[PDB]
Symmetry: D2
Subunit: 255 residues, 4 copies
């Protein structure tokens, strides 16, 4: 039973509650019928596997920041990349726009910040070994692409998310859960792949600026809807996500 | 305050207790005077950042390739493989040197692929710097042209030229029963400062059950750690958020 | 900083939000100007130290007992004085639950039950080099408390002391009430630490709840943008839960 | 699966090792053939439950507690002192007996008054039952007319008369290097069944600073626990709610 949203028919009524039911329960959904055209998606997927072409190979990672004329049909990798990103930005602003109205805050509430792109290419390569470490995107949102077929933690159990072609996974980042007042949830995920199978993924990451500090949202607290999160500065927030105190499954074992 | 060890003078008596003092307090040390020579290490580092030399308005902050292995050449599958099997030796000289501090026969271990992690970190600006964990799987040897989590502070590890720092993985800690313990680490770097890195990670194949080592648990040297199958140990190692503090 | 509510003047704009600011920050307040008469409070306290009096020295003794025709209109001697206070405390309680249900815009009648019981702890004087009883969070449904010595809460990891002042009643919310509320109001965590060589009599009314309509966050308080912070568990798996878990214990902190 | 130990045979290797088998795996045992005699135990149980002569002649009953420090009889200040000082003896025979399984001289001491908890849970009405924690002292010896958390399950401890149940406290565990463990326990009753209990608790005074035991930690048997002062140890012990399952 997996949440799907249609980018059209949002501003809808039902597809707009579908967003809500999706963001509260799972913190993620997969968005179909957006604006990006399948012609562009496959080329980003494929120009990517191309850009990366005993001793065998397990993965390739590049992550890099975005932020003449330009072809209505791009074809250079440095150019096809740009149409999709600025295709994703529009998809994004449609999203936070719908949210701000699910939460009954002005739509304009949400505002700019830098953008990042992470490419993970997981080639085939025959073998019987699995390796990678779950994490939760500590940012605003993340818009994710996959061709060559991904899992989230809910109720301690892990469950798989079927990535289906020409559709886009979109999940919420931690700081955005703070800001939503926990009304919407930032999920936990991990990637597990089998060695000898292809898995190209390209994920857009939207962080946020040195601005008015990560605290829960303005007109969303009153006398009877208290704040679930403390007010921390954009910077104590950043150091936080890279500072760990005590944990580890190895100590889970200690006795 | 950083232990430096010598691969020579090892066994010895002085460099042989440096390990204990290093591996018990903070899980790792920096090895000088290995078998590996600067021509080779420089050539792996320079043949490495090369695997990817041209894109602008998309600026770059990353670069990883992950690959399995198993005098001086200059094809890649070879500058690597001369380095790869040079590290294999350094691995086994401590695993020998270390079963030896444990008051057991040296050969107890000797048990399954090896992995290689490549990184390189170059951009153009200053940071929009936006993760800590512990290398959880039996010994890893690290090269660069990192910080450790002791007691609550994150004390950082100065890496010195052409030396190979080596830290223990969780699988090791469980087995020798915590006498030496696997540290926790993080990487924080500046945008506009390069750091090419090369790590060799040694895990183990589906053999043995991961349990602390038979010959060091007396009647009153009990086991502090349980036995898990190299199956659920795996599922443990891949299965809190700073948001939760609030 | 110390919250106090005036029981009269409650059901009035300001003293009614004084309750809210109190229940949100720390699980408790100090209620003054209740209906109970100072004559009766002192006799409970004193008829109580009495009931327990009737190298080897004494450090504490506790009594536990459940609540529920001619009866003394006014004075008594013990076991009748107890009843006037208890059924003086039930009224104080129902006045309080009533205001809470209106602070959160839910019908007042919602809270309606179903038993009640009382814990008596008497802490005599002694010699002095030792401290034993501790921490716990009142698991249940609000508690009404009496004291005449001088009690600690664990808000913000640090521990602060609560000044217990005479002819005043300390009152805190129970665990099942934070669940029942939507976490809007909080059930505090507390401890008692006393010095050997000091008197400390305390009597706490505890109001629990019956096996009835299941512990869930409160009905008309969830809408489309007020999700529920707590799961619905049976009145029974709730009871077993509070007496059975794993945790770390300060001895494990030391494990290193 | 309850280890039962004998005060007699508390050497001879046979009852001397069930003790060890009890204290490592579970943390407690039940002693038969002590020095304490049923004429006495019975009198402490009857002089105590009686400490409540006749109060009431609309308020039903839940329980009675007595908490007080200790150091021919048949006065209450005397059946206790004969009982109290019979327990001191059982304490030191065990403190001796487990100082030798630890391979050191017996003389731990560094001992630290004595405290006595009396709990009587008389009957009343049945309906409902709306403590889990660990005795964080040193040792506690229990008499009755509860449950232990072995792993995830809560398994019951059958107390049979007139034997004396005896468990380890946290500071004992810290002092060994955890070789013997401090268990966790709970009490569950139906209301309407008598349960008189008498427990003697052994703490230690503001002295020699709680750290694991000198002559048990060597080059390949490190200390698993840090040193805390009898002061900071105290504040820890009286300083996650099931509601948080949430």
């Amino acid at each position: 039973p997996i949440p799907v949203v249609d980018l059209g028919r949002l501003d809808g009524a039902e597809e707009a509650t579908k967003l809500r039911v999706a963001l509260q329960n799972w913190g993620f959904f997969l968005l179909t019928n957006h604006g990006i055209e399948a012609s562009l998606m496959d080329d980003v997927m494929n120009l990517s596997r191309e850009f990366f072409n005993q001793v065998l190979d397990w993965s390739d990672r590049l992550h890099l920041r975005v932020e003449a004329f330009w072809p209505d049909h791009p074809e250079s990798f440095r150019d096809v990349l740009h149409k999709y990103a600025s295709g994703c930005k529009r998809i994004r602003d449609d999203i936070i726009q719908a949210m701000a109205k699910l939460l009954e805050l002005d739509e304009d509430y949400f505002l700019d910040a830098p953008t990042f792109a992470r490419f993970n290419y997981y080639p085939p390569c025959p073998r019987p070994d699995l390796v990678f470490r779950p994490h939760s995107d500590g940012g605003l949102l993340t818009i994710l692409l996959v061709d060559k077929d991904l899992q989230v933690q809910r109720d301690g159990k892990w469950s798989n998310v079927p990535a289906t072609p020409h559709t886009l996974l979109i999940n919420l980042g931690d700081t955005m859960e703070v800001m939503c007042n926990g009304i919407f949830k930032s999920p936990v995920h991990r990637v597990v792949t089998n060695a000898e199978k292809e898995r190209i993924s390209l994920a857009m990451l939207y962080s946020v600026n040195d601005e008015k500090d990560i605290e829960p949202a303005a007109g969303l607290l009153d006398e009877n809807r208290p704040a679930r999160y403390r007010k921390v500065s954009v910077e104590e927030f950043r150091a936080g996500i890279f500072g760990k105190f005590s944990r580890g499954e190895r100590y889970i074992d200690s006795l």
